[PDB]
Every structure is written in C-alpha cells, then in structure tokens.
Enzyme design. Structure first.
Site, PDB file in Angstrom:
ATOM      1  N   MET A 161       8.895   2.832  14.269  1.00  0.00           N
ATOM      2  CA  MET A 161       7.615   2.789  13.572  1.00  0.00           C
ATOM      3  C   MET A 161       7.432   4.027  12.709  1.00  0.00           C
ATOM      4  SD  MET A 161       7.039  -0.131  14.619  1.00  0.00           S
ATOM      5  CE  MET A 161       5.533  -0.489  13.701  1.00  0.00           C
ATOM      6  N   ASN A 192      11.465   8.982  15.889  1.00  0.00           N
ATOM      7  CA  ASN A 192      11.275   8.381  14.575  1.00  0.00           C
ATOM      8  C   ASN A 192      10.566   9.279  13.573  1.00  0.00           C
ATOM      9  OD1 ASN A 192      12.419   5.921  15.584  1.00  0.00           O
ATOM     10  ND2 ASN A 192      10.465   5.631  16.661  1.00  0.00           N
ATOM     11  N   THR A 193      10.261  10.513  13.942  1.00  0.00           N
ATOM     12  CA  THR A 193       9.852  11.504  12.971  1.00  0.00           C
ATOM     13  C   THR A 193      10.878  12.621  12.994  1.00  0.00           C
ATOM     14  OG1 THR A 193       7.487  11.018  13.047  1.00  0.00           O
ATOM     15  CG2 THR A 193       8.185  13.222  12.393  1.00  0.00           C
ATOM     16  N   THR A 205       0.004   6.585  18.818  1.00  0.00           N
ATOM     17  CA  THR A 205      -0.225   7.882  18.192  1.00  0.00           C
ATOM     18  C   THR A 205      -0.897   7.943  16.903  1.00  0.00           C
ATOM     19  OG1 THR A 205       1.731   8.891  19.368  1.00  0.00           O
ATOM     20  CG2 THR A 205       1.193   9.795  17.205  1.00  0.00           C
ATOM     21  N   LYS A 221      -2.572   1.802  17.950  1.00  0.00           N
ATOM     22  CA  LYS A 221      -2.423   3.149  17.353  1.00  0.00           C
ATOM     23  C   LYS A 221      -3.729   3.609  16.720  1.00  0.00           C
ATOM     24  CE  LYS A 221       2.354   3.874  15.991  1.00  0.00           C
ATOM     25  NZ  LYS A 221       3.491   3.306  16.747  1.00  0.00           N
ATOM     26  N   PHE A 240       5.046   6.587  13.448  1.00  0.00           N
ATOM     27  CA  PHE A 240       3.633   6.961  13.425  1.00  0.00           C
ATOM     28  C   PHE A 240       2.920   6.337  12.227  1.00  0.00           C
ATOM     29  CE2 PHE A 240       4.535  11.336  15.571  1.00  0.00           C
ATOM     30  CZ  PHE A 240       4.735  10.711  16.782  1.00  0.00           C
ATOM     31  N   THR A 266       8.082   8.425  30.446  1.00  0.00           N
ATOM     32  CA  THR A 266       9.052   8.884  29.427  1.00  0.00           C
ATOM     33  C   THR A 266       8.917   7.981  28.206  1.00  0.00           C
ATOM     34  OG1 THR A 266      11.065  10.148  29.837  1.00  0.00           O
ATOM     35  CG2 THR A 266      11.359   7.830  29.296  1.00  0.00           C
ATOM     36  N   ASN A 267       9.256   8.478  27.017  1.00  0.00           N
ATOM     37  CA  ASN A 267       9.176   7.695  25.754  1.00  0.00           C
ATOM     38  C   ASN A 267      10.408   6.803  25.587  1.00  0.00           C
ATOM     39  OD1 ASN A 267       8.388   6.961  22.998  1.00  0.00           O
ATOM     40  ND2 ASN A 267       7.174   8.832  23.054  1.00  0.00           N
ATOM     41  N   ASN A 299       2.357  14.068  21.643  1.00  0.00           N
ATOM     42  CA  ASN A 299       3.617  13.320  21.490  1.00  0.00           C
ATOM     43  C   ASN A 299       4.665  14.173  20.786  1.00  0.00           C
ATOM     44  OD1 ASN A 299       5.537  11.320  21.052  1.00  0.00           O
ATOM     45  ND2 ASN A 299       4.186  10.106  19.737  1.00  0.00           N
ATOM     46  N   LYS A 347       3.854  14.269  26.341  1.00  0.00           N
ATOM     47  CA  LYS A 347       4.791  13.127  26.492  1.00  0.00           C
ATOM     48  C   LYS A 347       6.206  13.568  26.132  1.00  0.00           C
ATOM     49  CE  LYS A 347       5.029   8.186  25.904  1.00  0.00           C
ATOM     50  NZ  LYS A 347       4.336   7.011  25.331  1.00  0.00           N
ATOM     51  N   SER A 379       8.794  11.118  20.066  1.00  0.00           N
ATOM     52  CA  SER A 379       9.203  10.035  19.187  1.00  0.00           C
ATOM     53  C   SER A 379      10.556  10.363  18.556  1.00  0.00           C
ATOM     54  CB  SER A 379       8.181   9.817  18.083  1.00  0.00           C
ATOM     55  OG  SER A 379       8.663   8.843  17.163  1.00  0.00           O
ATOM     56  N   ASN A 408      12.154   0.183  18.277  1.00  0.00           N
ATOM     57  CA  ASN A 408      11.200   0.441  17.216  1.00  0.00           C
ATOM     58  C   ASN A 408      11.519   1.757  16.530  1.00  0.00           C
ATOM     59  OD1 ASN A 408       8.879   2.622  17.246  1.00  0.00           O
ATOM     60  ND2 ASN A 408       9.506   2.244  19.378  1.00  0.00           N
TER      61      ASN A 408
HETATM   62  C1  LIG Z   1       6.586  -0.798  19.186  1.00  0.00           C
HETATM   63  C2  LIG Z   1       6.363   0.450  19.991  1.00  0.00           C
HETATM   64  C3  LIG Z   1       5.524   1.429  19.496  1.00  0.00           C
HETATM   65  C4  LIG Z   1       5.307   2.591  20.237  1.00  0.00           C
HETATM   66  N1  LIG Z   1       4.457   3.560  19.753  1.00  0.00           N
HETATM   67  C5  LIG Z   1       4.258   4.695  20.500  1.00  0.00           C
HETATM   68  C6  LIG Z   1       3.362   5.653  20.037  1.00  0.00           C
HETATM   69  O1  LIG Z   1       2.803   5.511  18.956  1.00  0.00           O
HETATM   70  N2  LIG Z   1       3.179   6.808  20.741  1.00  0.00           N
HETATM   71  C7  LIG Z   1       3.821   6.988  21.949  1.00  0.00           C
HETATM   72  O2  LIG Z   1       3.636   8.022  22.569  1.00  0.00           O
HETATM   73  N3  LIG Z   1       4.687   6.041  22.434  1.00  0.00           N
HETATM   74  C8  LIG Z   1       4.914   4.886  21.715  1.00  0.00           C
HETATM   75  N4  LIG Z   1       5.757   3.924  22.214  1.00  0.00           N
HETATM   76  C9  LIG Z   1       6.461   4.119  23.538  1.00  0.00           C
HETATM   77  C10 LIG Z   1       5.676   3.583  24.758  1.00  0.00           C
HETATM   78  O3  LIG Z   1       4.376   4.129  24.723  1.00  0.00           O
HETATM   79  C11 LIG Z   1       6.480   3.947  26.011  1.00  0.00           C
HETATM   80  O4  LIG Z   1       6.470   5.361  26.155  1.00  0.00           O
HETATM   81  C12 LIG Z   1       7.912   3.396  25.930  1.00  0.00           C
HETATM   82  O5  LIG Z   1       7.945   2.189  25.165  1.00  0.00           O
HETATM   83  C13 LIG Z   1       8.425   3.108  27.343  1.00  0.00           C
HETATM   84  O6  LIG Z   1       7.543   2.168  27.946  1.00  0.00           O
HETATM   85  P1  LIG Z   1       7.887   0.631  28.072  1.00  0.00           P
HETATM   86  O7  LIG Z   1       9.330   0.469  28.484  1.00  0.00           O
HETATM   87  O8  LIG Z   1       6.930   0.044  29.095  1.00  0.00           O
HETATM   88  O9  LIG Z   1       7.573  -0.034  26.752  1.00  0.00           O
HETATM   89  C14 LIG Z   1       5.938   2.773  21.467  1.00  0.00           C
HETATM   90  C15 LIG Z   1       6.777   1.790  21.944  1.00  0.00           C
HETATM   91  C16 LIG Z   1       6.999   0.641  21.219  1.00  0.00           C
HETATM   92  C17 LIG Z   1       7.930  -0.378  21.800  1.00  0.00           C
HETATM   93  O1  LIG Z   2       5.608   5.269  16.099  1.00  0.00           O
HETATM   94  C1  LIG Z   2       6.734   5.600  16.407  1.00  0.00           C
HETATM   95  O2  LIG Z   2       7.720   5.521  15.705  1.00  0.00           O
HETATM   96  C2  LIG Z   2       6.920   6.188  17.766  1.00  0.00           C
HETATM   97  C3  LIG Z   2       6.184   7.253  18.234  1.00  0.00           C
HETATM   98  C4  LIG Z   2       6.430   7.761  19.554  1.00  0.00           C
HETATM   99  O3  LIG Z   2       5.841   8.708  20.081  1.00  0.00           O
HETATM  100  N1  LIG Z   2       7.418   7.110  20.250  1.00  0.00           N
HETATM  101  C5  LIG Z   2       8.167   6.048  19.807  1.00  0.00           C
HETATM  102  O4  LIG Z   2       9.028   5.530  20.508  1.00  0.00           O
HETATM  103  N2  LIG Z   2       7.882   5.610  18.537  1.00  0.00           N
END
Ligand SMILES: Cc1cc2nc3c(=O)[nH]c(=O)nc-3n(C[C@H](O)[C@H](O)[C@H](O)COP(=O)(O)O)c2cc1C
Ligand SMILES: O=C(O)c1cc(=O)[nH]c(=O)[nH]1
Ligand SMILES: Cc1cc2nc3c(=O)[nH]c(=O)nc-3n(C[C@H](O)[C@H](O)[C@H](O)COP(=O)(O)O)c2cc1C
Ligand SMILES: CCCCCCCc1cc(O)c2ccccc2[n+]1[O-]
Ligand SMILES: CCCCCCCc1cc(O)c2ccccc2[n+]1[O-]
Ligand SMILES: O=C(O)c1cc(=O)[nH]c(=O)[nH]1
Lengths: 335, 335
Positions: free
Chosen positions: B112, B176-177, B85, B65, B114, B244-245, B171, B216, B174, B110
């Site tokens: 998190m 989570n905001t 992010t 991040k 941001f 996709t997120n 982004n 995203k 998420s 998660n």
């Molecule tokens: C712990 C964690 C933190 C993540 N943080 C972000 C993030 O900060 N910004 C973002 O756009 N996606 C974030 N993602 C989502 C991934 O970038 C991805 O879009 C999502 O996990 C699907 O991909 P995957 O199944 O390969 O993990 C996060 C995912 C996880 C598991």
């Molecule tokens: O940091 C996070 O909470 C977060 C950000 C984001 O864009 N996507 C996600 O799954 N988590």
C-alpha cells in the site's frame, strides 16, 4: 460440502459417529460405489525411505485400525495410508467413553488403548485391498504384555505383516497403554530397536522384499530425551521416524469442554508443539534419516510448516475429521 | 454465512472488494441496517497499558486507514479498533496493483505505502464516531519526509490526535516506505523514542491526561535486533509493543500465485514467525511492558498460542478477510 456433513456427524457421540461412517465405508470400499467418496488429486511423487510415495500426504494411524477401508480411503486421494495400531492378539481397549471432541479448538482427546481385532485379522483385510499408494502397518504391544517383553509383541506382528506392508510403523508413543512410552527411553529403546532391526534383516532374506521400518515418537519428550532418541535411531539405522503422536499437554485448551479428560490431545492444539518437536529432531538427525510430520496439520500452510521444519512427508487425522476430504485435495494440490 | 459473502467479494480484485465493502458499511451506519453487521460478543474485560479493553481482540491497523467505519466495525464485536496508518499530509501510496490475495494460503501481500487522507481528516472522522471500545490511532512518516527526520512526522500527528486517541501506535515496520524499517535500529530508534516520549510528556501537561504509546515492530528483525529494540523500549518507558507487521519472507508461499509480488505477506503464512518473534520479545521484556500480538491469527488456538508466547492482547486483519465476523465471535468467546 463437509461443513453440513460435520454438523450432522457432530450431533452423534465421537466414537459412534466414526463407527457409522466406517460401516458405510466398509460397504463401498473396493467396489465401484467408491465413486461416492472419490476425489481426483494431482500426482506429487516423493522418494522417502527408499520408496516412492505417489504424493506427500498420508492418513495417520488410528482411523482404520483394522484395515477395513483401505481402498475407499485411498480413493479420497491419500498418497499413503497407515493402518493400525494392531496388536498380536485382539483386545478391546479402554472403557467407553474414551473419545472426546473439542469443537472450538478443532482438537480431539482420546484414550482408545489400542482397540483392534488383532494382526491376523488385519492381514486378511490387507490381502483384499488394491491400493496403489504406500500402505504402512502400525504395530504395538498388547495391553497385558510385560513392557520388558514388548519386543516379543512387535516381532510377531512383523513376521505376519512383512509380506504385505510397504512400510512398518513402531508405535511406542501412545499414552493409553501404561508404561508404553518408557520404550523410547535409553536401554529399553536400544534393545527394542536391535531386535526390530535384526528381524527386519531376517525377514528381508525370507521374503526377498525391502520394507522400511519407522518409529513413531511422542511430542512430550524432553530435549535430552529427544536427543537420546534421535541418536538411537541413527545408531540402529532405523529407516525413518514419525513425529509426533498425541500430547498430555492441555495448555491451549483450558476452560474448554472435555479439556480435563485423560488421554492424548490431537488436532490444532497439538500443531505448534509437534512442529517444534520436528525442528529440534531434524536439527539432531541432520539428514541421516527422514521424518514423517504429524500434529494438527489442518491446512496447506500448516503442512508446509512441517516440511520447512524438516519433515519429508506429512500425515493428518484430526484435520480430516474437522475439515473433511477437501483437506486432502488442498494439501496434495498445493503442498 | 460469510463463505457466501467471501465467494462474491473475491470476484472483485482485493482493493475493489474492500472499498465496495466499506461503501456499504459507511451507508448502513446509524440505520436499522447496521444490525446485519452487529454481532453480540461475550464481555472479556482486560486491562492493558492502563486502559480497559472491552475484550482482548482488536482490529489491526490498515483496514480502516482513514477512520471511516469505526462504528460499523465496532458493532462487530472488536474490543478495540486501530485506525491508520495515517501520515501528516495526505498521500496516494504506491501504484495499483498493490494488494494481492493468496487464497490457498489464506495470506495477503500488500505494498500500500500509507495511502491515506491525512491526519486532519482522520481526526474529523474520529469526532463523528460513537464506538465505546478502545480506539488505537496508528501514525507514520510521509513518503517524502527524509528518513533521518522521520520523527518530525510522528510528532505532528501525535499533537493533532492526542486529545482523541485511546492509544497511539507508532509504525516503523511497514516494508513499503523506503527506509522506514531503519527507524527501529540503533541510534535512529533511540532518537525517535526520545522525541516521542518528550512529546508525550509535553502533551500530557497540555491536555491533562496520559495517552499510552505502542511501537509496532517487524517480524524480519534478527534475535540481536529484537534484544536491542526491547532494551530501547524499556529504557525509553514506551507503554507497549505491537508485534508483528508484515513479512518479506516467502518461504511458505513458493509456487503460489502472487508469491513474487513485492510487499509484505500477512495471514496464515506469517503466523509461526509472528509467534516466535513474540515469544523471544517476551523473554527480553520480562513483563516490563505489554505485547499486543498480531500476525496470522485465524483461530481461537492461534490467538491462544500468542497469549501463551507472552501477548496480553491480540489483533486480526487477514483472518477477518478470510474467515469473516464469525472469527471475532469465535476468538472473543473462547480466548
Ligand atoms: C492490506 C493491508 C494493509 C495494512 N495496512 C497497515 C497499516 O496501515 N498500518 C499497520 O501498522 N499495519 C498494516 N497492515 C498490517 C496488519 O495491521 C498486521 O500487522 C499484519 O497484516 C499481520 O496481521 P494479520 O496476519 O492478521 O493480517 C496491513 C496489512 C494488510 C494486509
Ligand atoms: O500501507 C502500507 O503499505 C503498510 C503500512 C504498514 O505499517 N505495514 C504494512 O504492512 N503496510
Ligand atoms: C481417535 C484417535 C485414534 C488414534 N489412534 C492411533 C493409533 O492407533 N496409532 C497411532 O500411532 N496413532 C494414533 N492416533 C494419533 C494420530 C496422530 O499421530 C496424532 O493424532 C496427531 O495427528 P493429528 O493432530 O492430525 O490428529 C490416534 C489419534 C486419534 C485422535
Ligand atoms: C466420511 C468422511 C470422513 C469423515 C470421517 C468421520 C468419522 C469420524 C467422525 C468423528 O466425529 C470423529 C471424532 C473423533 C475421532 C474420529 C472421528 N471419526 O473417525
Ligand atoms: C464485511 C466482511 C468483512 C471482511 C471485509 C471484506 C472486504 C475485503 C475483502 C478483501 O478481499 C480484502 C482483501 C484485502 C484487504 C482487505 C479486504 N477487504 O477489506
Ligand atoms: O489407541 C490408542 O490408545 C492410541 C495409540 C497411539 O499411538 N496414540 C494415541 O493417541 N492413542
């Protein structure tokens, strides 16, 4: 650890590796020496087709075609074991080489052609087994039998296995017996099912035993084809449907070794298609009869994807090759 | 072998495993110990959004991040790395525990929120990196900033990072905001996209270069919502869509530990949904802008299934955690 055993097995030609492993399984099946392959897995009873399956995971057909290793394979934790395909008379299948690995794609291509020792031999082996799971016996047509007389082959097999089978599987989806997949289209399917349903009733009164019959379909059926196939199964009160056999598709394995070989593609490159087939089929069937989901199941999530698309049970083959016995424990424990 | 590394790290809670790993990565960077992370991968150049990518496989956002291990992670064979992010001002994110492993599902949850050190700090880190692939920089809204003025935050970051980014990722997905996901609906999206494109236009004139913008989106969008998002992205001339997120869905993780934990699900439990989202979005976009596919890619075939659904590039996060660097080599080699 299976990764090490697989690396070794994978040095050998696909069909050779299978014959060696099953030689070893033959010599221990039904003997106390099956502790070498025994895995404890939890009980997860499922009612399906009027039978109790001790757990939702079966071994798909084609691995133990002659019924040689039922107890050894049951000892690894399968809740059902589908043996076959068996044909009324033995036949050698198609010419070697006829089995190919796609290691990076964790898939298989095969054009076996129903290589089996015949239904009489299969019954003798089944008589010796003591498996407490559900045994399914898969049956198909001799290569040389006219496709218009395919029914006659399925009915002789039925007479000989009815007394010893928990369920019977009607294979009309192999792409390796010419013309066989036509038996899932229109009037051909209707006539075959009417014959099978009449023999099942006859056989039920003869042996006083309820034995469900499930038809195994292919994943290359079109939407109208699938629709017509679902309708026929309901109209003839077939007890369930096994979806899905191998695919002639190669869209996800291009540029890979052996991708151009003829035959059926299985394993991970079949996963998505088979799940879509089961969804669409479930939407048509609307709970009228159950689906046994088969197609690239290689993890508990993939197994659960098939449950979510409509399957009541699941079967694995290629995932057993690429991930080994541990996959059985994973899937039974967490599905 | 990664399986040994995984067993060790999984003795730590996921957040501690991660920061312990990243300490070691920051320390081996620029030393002859960087070769323990280095993996030679085949070149598979791909042009997308007017950039040339080393290969089709990128590291999804959220692992780095603050942009602290660009070099060590690049050395691992990624053709692009997305950092963030990041938000305008630093913020701690949500309360720990906020990250959870679902080991049998190879998924993560998660919340998190941001957690990051702020855009100014990420920029200082980018200046010190030597990576030669495509750098994506993913930006978001500070928690306190009102949802209706969320665009202010995206624009502040765009100005501080434009001179340094290969592409910019917006982004709005998420979970989570609070309310962030409403910025992909209706007039909010139209407003956000307009302000962003105008900033892009102003910034191209100031810096004399075009840096593409990708938005995203989420997998929890409806068909109607996805049609509207695609139409808005085309009408506003956005350079790409990252689908996709994470998902609010728990349909495939029921009965598993941490399944009721609030947040987004990632990993194998999101694969199918992500793919179906991409397929639908791809029909709507009809080639007018590229899709970067992400969600549960844990294999060559899973990456290829995304390409088949319409993605030009793919990204991985959870599968790198569960299968490790060998997954980078596997995908880039055989994708
Ligand atoms: C712990 C964690 C933190 C993540 N943080 C972000 C993030 O900060 N910004 C973002 O756009 N996606 C974030 N993602 C989502 C991934 O970038 C991805 O879009 C999502 O996990 C699907 O991909 P995957 O199944 O390969 O993990 C996060 C995912 C996880 C598991
Ligand atoms: O940091 C996070 O909470 C977060 C950000 C984001 O864009 N996507 C996600 O799954 N988590
Ligand atoms: C080598 C091989 C032999 C097979 N033999 C049979 C068979 O005899 N009868 C049958 O109905 N299916 C057979 N199958 C298909 C099985 C299953 O229906 C299909 O492979 C999809 O499952 P999978 O992807 O888990 O392997 C065979 C598959 C393979 C790879
Ligand atoms: C003994 C533990 C279980 C492993 C069984 C392996 C035997 C085996 C090994 C393979 O490489 C195969 C490749 C293609 C088709 C079938 C195969 N079989 O059946
Ligand atoms: C160097 C090995 C590559 C994998 C990184 C391992 C560190 C690691 C381990 C985990 O268990 C995690 C769980 C959730 C999110 C991130 C995680 N990270 O980054
Ligand atoms: O043995 C075969 O040829 C065979 C039968 C079947 O049903 N499916 C398959 O892929 N192969």
């Amino acid at each position: 650890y299976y990764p090490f055993v697989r690396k070794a097995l994978f040095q050998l030609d696909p069909e050779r590796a299978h014959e060696f492993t099953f030689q070893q399984l033959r010599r221990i099946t039904g003997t106390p020496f099956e502790a070498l392959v025994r895995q404890k897995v939890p009980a997860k009873p499922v009612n399906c087709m009027g039978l109790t399956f001790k757990n939702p995971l079966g071994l798909a057909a084609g691995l133990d075609k002659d019924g040689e290793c039922i107890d050894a394979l049951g000892a690894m934790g399968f809740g059902s074991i589908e043996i076959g395909t068996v044909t009324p008379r033995p036949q050698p299948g198609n010419d070697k080489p006829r089995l190919f690995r796609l290691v990076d794609a964790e898939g298989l291509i095969n054009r076996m052609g129903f290589n089996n020792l015949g239904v009489d031999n299969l019954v003798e082996n089944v008589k010796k087994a003591h498996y407490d799971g559900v045994l399914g016996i898969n049956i198909g047509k001799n290569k040389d039998t006219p496709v218009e007389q395919g029914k006659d082959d399925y009915l002789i097999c039925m007479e000989k296995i009815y007394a010893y089978a928990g369920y019977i599987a009607i294979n009309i989806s192999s792409p390796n017996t010419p013309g066989l997949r036509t038996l899932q289209y229109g009037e051909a399917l209707d006539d075959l099912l009417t014959a099978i349903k009449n023999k099942q009733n006859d056989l039920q009164a003869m042996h006083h035993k309820y034995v469900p019959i499930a038809v195994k379909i292919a994943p290359d059926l079109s939407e109208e084809e699938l629709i017509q196939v679902a309708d026929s199964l309901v109209r003839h009160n077939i007890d369930g449907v096994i979806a899905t056999n191998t695919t002639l598709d190669r869209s996800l394995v291009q540029g890979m070794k052996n991708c151009d070989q003829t035959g059926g593609l299985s394993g991970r490159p079949l996963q998505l298609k088979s799940t879509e087939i089961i969804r669409r089929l479930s939407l048509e069937l609307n709970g009228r009869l159950p689906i046994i989901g088969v197609g690239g199941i290689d993890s508990v999530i993939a197994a659960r994807e098939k449950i979510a698309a409509g399957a009541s049970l699941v079967q694995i083959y290629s995932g057993f090759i690429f991930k080994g016995p541990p996959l059985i424990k994973e899937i039974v424990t967490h599905i």
